[PDB]
From a paper:
Experimental kinetic, biophysical and structural characterisation of the naturally occurring, but previously biochemically uncharacterised, KPC-2G89D mutant with several antibiotics and inhibitors reveals significant changes in hydrolytic spectrum, specifically reducing activity towards carbapenems without effecting major structural or stability changes.
Strikingly, steady-state kinetic measurements reveal significant changes to the hydrolytic profile of KPC-2G89D, compared to that of wild-type KPC-2. The differences in calculated residue networks indicate that a glycine to aspartate substitution at position 89 affects the intramolecular communication network within KPC-2.
Residue numbers in the entry: 24 to 57, 59 to 252, 254 to 294
Write the structure that this text describes.
């Protein structure tokens, strides 16, 4: 009834891109939604790292000393693209610092260290089940989880489930209030998403996001919570993939899909 009240040209956009685009956007005020391929599975790539940080924050509600716990690691823990943790190899970092690095720099060593704390891919999946997400699955570690193989459900979710879980964790009651705001603040501080959903969001609105880029199969994504001034926040997810292993991803297509989602919701930008 409130889904796709206004049609938008997502099909032309994905055809120009040469792949598939999945979009689910929720106006948390009215409950109106924009939905395009929203229940298809797409690879998470680095976007799981946002949910990883939320799972750590959930654990910190029962373990008050968790976030400030200092974690030492060896050179064997460094994974390609670990821009923060490589600078602290000789000192260690706290759990909170590793969480911020995973969210805000997509730091791979930090992500694997935090996965270990939670009991691996199955432990993160269990956390997502605990907030009512039956779609999300993490199966592998960095970097193997980026293979983005067509038809492979490992390490995937849907745009809809991503948006629904993001809403629960940033605006709903899945986290206690202090942890909720810390999750929001980490997302707001992301550095990797300036050319994705943020490029469609006016500079005078608050926004937090987490990107994903698999490096193959034109596969990349972003999810965000957006606070337009004077109205309720919007939660949205934009995922892409393409049929050929060497197909390139496009940041511009993600930004364009976000613009169409905001237009479909009647959110003036």
């Amino acid at each position: 009834m409130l889904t796709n009240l206004v049609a938008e040209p997502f099909a032309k956009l994905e055809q120009d891109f040469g792949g598939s685009i999945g979009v689910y956007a929720m106006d948390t005020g009215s409950g109106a939604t924009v939905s395009y391929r929203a229940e298809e599975r797409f690879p998470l790539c680095s976007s799981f790292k946002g949910f990883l940080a939320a799972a750590v924050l959930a654990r910190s509600q029962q373990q008050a000393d968790l976030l400030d716990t200092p974690i030492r690691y060896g050179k064997n823990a460094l994974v390609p693209w670990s821009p923060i943790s490589e600078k602290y190899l000789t000192t260690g970092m706290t759990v909170a610092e590793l969480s911020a690095a995973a969210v805000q720099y997509s730091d791979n060593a930090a992500a694997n260290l935090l996965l270990k704390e939670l009991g691996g891919p199955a432990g993160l999946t269990a956390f997502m089940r605990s907030i009512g997400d039956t779609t999300f699955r993490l199966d592998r570690w960095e970097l193997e989880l980026n293979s983005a193989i067509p038809g492979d459900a490992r390490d995937t979710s849907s745009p809809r489930a991503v948006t629904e879980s993001l809403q629960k964790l940033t605006l709903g009651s899945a986290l206690a209030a202090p942890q909720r705001q810390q999750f929001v603040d980490w997302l707001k501080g992301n550095t990797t998403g300036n050319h994705r959903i943020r490029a469609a969001v006016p500079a005078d609105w608050a926004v937090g996001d987490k990107t994903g880029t698999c490096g193959v199969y034109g596969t990349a994504n972003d999810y965000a919570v957006v606070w337009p001034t004077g109205r309720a926040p919007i939660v949205l997810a934009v995922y892409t993939r393409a049929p050929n292993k060497d197909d390139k991803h496009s940041e511009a297509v993600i930004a364009a899909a976000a613009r169409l989602a905001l237009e479909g919701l009647g959110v003036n930008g």
